[PDB]
Write a protein that binds this ligand. Sequence first.
Ligand SMILES: *C(=O)c1ccc(-c2ccc(C(=O)OCC)cn2)nc1
Ligand SMILES: *NNC(=O)c1ccc(-c2ccc(C(N)=O)cn2)nc1
Length: 9
Amino acid sequence: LAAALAQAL
Ligand SMILES: *C(=O)c1ccc(-c2ccc(C(=O)OCC)cn2)nc1
Ligand SMILES: *NNC(=O)c1ccc(-c2ccc(C(N)=O)cn2)nc1
């Protein structure tokens, strides 16, 4: 989940 969002950065 964290990675799914982290791709933005
Ligand atoms: C959420 O974006 C998220 C959470 C966890 C994972 C993930 C990917 C790969 C592994 C892995 O290779 O584990 C080996 C024990 C674990 N968790 N991806 C994305
Ligand atoms: N928000 N994330 C990024 O901007 C980001 C872009 C690219 C990468 C990355 C990581 C690792 C490799 C590699 N070849 O091992 C390439 N690009 N991370 C984050």
